[PDB]
Symmetry: C3
Subunit: 267 residues, 3 copies
């Protein structure tokens, strides 16, 4: 009733990892879908992931638990929108609901052919305060203007199910693909299976489309306490660019992984 | 038209049982491939009759599905569906479902009658008329909300959403509402007579809304939205459905 | 080098009842890395022409990582030979093993009514030259060379952006049907050991139905050979009966 889009996923073994936990990559993908739908409700046209803020993961959902994602447009700007993301997890046996993640993300309306956005409607006091908090967070976003022998290369062909019906590659899918490569790199240092704690704020620097090859390069970047930092770099190539060897930088993220809450589990 | 699929973790539920939605999907695909062998063109699910599951299938087992066109009408076709499960260590086979479905042809033309041969062929050919009569008569806890975005793999090559994809997404949300009643994990008993009352297409958003209605009965609502319609909040009602569970 | 490299973690979604990687998925992944290598050479869409002997010396498990390297060893005119290497690593132990060394052939598909002419492969190593030689001997060999029914509908993710059904996709559906037939003979879950050389005869396309039939062919005990047929139908072809022989393959399973 309040322009809040709601998803609900039960976690099958399909979404599961070697730990029986929900794949972090999948959560990222679901978060981006729900948020996009939130934006596309405000815009009327297709919207693409512009950037993500930092995401922290408080809990990881196990198989047999239900996840509930809620997204909302907090503020509309000129072509862009701030979308707020809440993520819960409910154990179907205990009844307990816990918070997984509060998160922010940015979407861009894509022109129909060859256009301005309406203002978001504010009813509550939370609406009016977050309306202002978005402009401060936006300053932070834009000012973010800064431009180990355990390497891992992967490659994914962008098929039609990985993109909207105009053919633009989904933000969430590149994030899902990133995360699995990152895990492979992080595991080269752990004696346990490590789980994702956070993704540092990053930007989608340019478009990707059906039939691109996305190349993922991952390396461990740092070690701290119980955790390990992995940089992933994403590059795009259409069929011709792929042969010539002149790709396009799509993004770079830093994912921080937790070695099962023990110092001993990493070298 | 025969389809055999083995049950793998990809298809399984939390307790290692083959997911009902996954079955419903495999039923439609096969029931659709039956219809498409008769019309020559693409076909879409018009309606579903009572489905009832006598057995639940488990990882490692194999499901065999048989579907055939009983009677072609003016633009629609009645299809029969048999569902067998086999154990690959026992050899034992068990019946999962006897179910009927109705498909409409979608030209971009008329349909010939089918080639009848058996005595049993004629019997189903006559009883289909009664069944079509019943199919047409349908004329009058906590709410679980979910949304799904229709991608290319969720539709035929012409862009039309599979009926079976909708029933699979329907089961996911219905199970959650059921689980939320008894604080446990249940299994699907049946799918009651409903009708898909409008098309759906790639790019649609399907909003699902499940509520506990009364052994439990989950009512699922499927509402469809353009990217434009999504903005204007005026969508299209695809279907309502009633699913019954035990725990 | 000139190597296309893919790394995949084996989740339960890629797995079987035991906790092993489905051979179907492995084959699909191998066809992709090889296809990516061909296209890096050709600069256009490439399809699977044929596959040599593939033998799996190990099976991987959930929570392990498969790494595939693919290289174009020689280009001819429309076709290229691709050398493939598959390794598996345990994510906890860190121990690696050879899964498979195999060979596949890819053909460059024209956009319009286009004549395609592939450039030579840049040779650097002495092993490069050795491989360029032995490619022709393998190319010559190539050109010289109870039961389960199933059906799959070709959708968008099963074909490249032009609409041509991937070789690896058919190769996946090809094992999932064979496994059941091998399960129907002896009452135990078996694992795939090798795939005998087979060619792709006709192209397939988005919207097709592929009908799969498999039978036990020959059983020298502790081994059961199972042949697979693959038959493709347009939507209209479907309703009339006349279809196309895509491929017939022989799979060796193990009890
Ligand atoms: C997002 C994108 C449009 C930014 O364009 P740009 O080169 O920065 O040019 P501009 O500065 O004019 O961007 C226009 C808008 O983007 C916003 N923007 C740019 N960088 C941003 C960031 N890091 N975070 C949030 N918003 C950002 C600007 O604030 C501006 O907003 P406004 O129109 O409401 O005033 C561009 O990088 C892009 O099209 N790539 C991602 C699209 C995509 O394909 N996403 C899926 C992943 S491949
Ligand atoms: C395989 C195919 C290319 C062979 O074509 P053809 O009818 O035999 O005609 P040609 O022999 O002239 O084919 C041209 C090339 O195919 C090669 N060829 C044919 N079968 C081959 C095989 N078994 N192994 C290696 N090369 C083969 C020839 O050597 C020739 O090579 P060149 O052009 O580099 O000199 C063709 O039948 C085809 O399009 N197959 C299906 C491809 C496909 O769609 N696969 C994806 C999954 S269905
Ligand atoms: C049935 C439908 C195809 C056409 O609308 P309609 O007004 O009900 O169609 P009509 O009754 O005028 O005629 C179409 C045929 O479908 C049959 N039909 C209509 N309602 C039916 C129902 N409740 N149950 C079974 N068959 C039904 C009719 O008997 C008629 O058969 P005929 O050609 O032999 O006379 C439907 O409303 C529709 O367009 N939705 C298609 C569903 C779809 O797109 N696929 C599923 C994913 S959304």
């Amino acid at each position: 009733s309040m322009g809040e889009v709601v998803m609900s996923q039960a976690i099958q073994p399909a979404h599961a990892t070697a730990r029986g936990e929900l794949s972090a990559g999948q959560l990222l993908k679901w978060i981006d879908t729900t948020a996009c739908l939130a934006a596309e409700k405000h815009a009327g046209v297709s919207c693409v992931t512009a950037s993500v803020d930092d995401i922290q993961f408080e809990e990881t959902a196990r198989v047999g638990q239900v996840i509930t994602i809620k997204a909302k447009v907090t503020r509309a700007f000129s072509t862009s929108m701030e979308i707020s993301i809440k993520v819960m997890v409910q154990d179907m046996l205990t009844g307990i609901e816990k918070l997984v993640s509060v998160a922010f993300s940015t979407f861009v309306a894509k022109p129909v052919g060859k256009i301005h956005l309406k203002p978001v409607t504010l009813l509550t006091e939370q609406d009016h305060v977050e309306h202002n908090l978005a402009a401060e967070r936006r300053k932070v976003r834009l000012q973010h203007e800064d431009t180990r022998g355990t390497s891992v290369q992967s490659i994914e062909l962008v098929l039609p199910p990985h993109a909207n019906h105009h053919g633009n590659t989904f933000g969430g899918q590149i994030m899902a693909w990133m995360e699995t490569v990152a895990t492979i790199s992080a595991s080269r240092l752990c004696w346990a299976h490590p789980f994702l704690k956070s993704v540092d704020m990053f930007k989608f620097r340019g478009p990707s489309t059906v039939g691109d090859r996305l190349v993922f390069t991952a390396i461990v970047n740092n070690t701290f306490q119980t955790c390990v930092e992995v940089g992933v770099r994403v590059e795009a190539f259409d069929c011709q660019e792929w042969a010539e060897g002149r790709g396009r930088h799509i993004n770079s993220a830093f994912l921080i992984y937790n070695a099962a809450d023990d110092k001993e589990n990493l070298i």
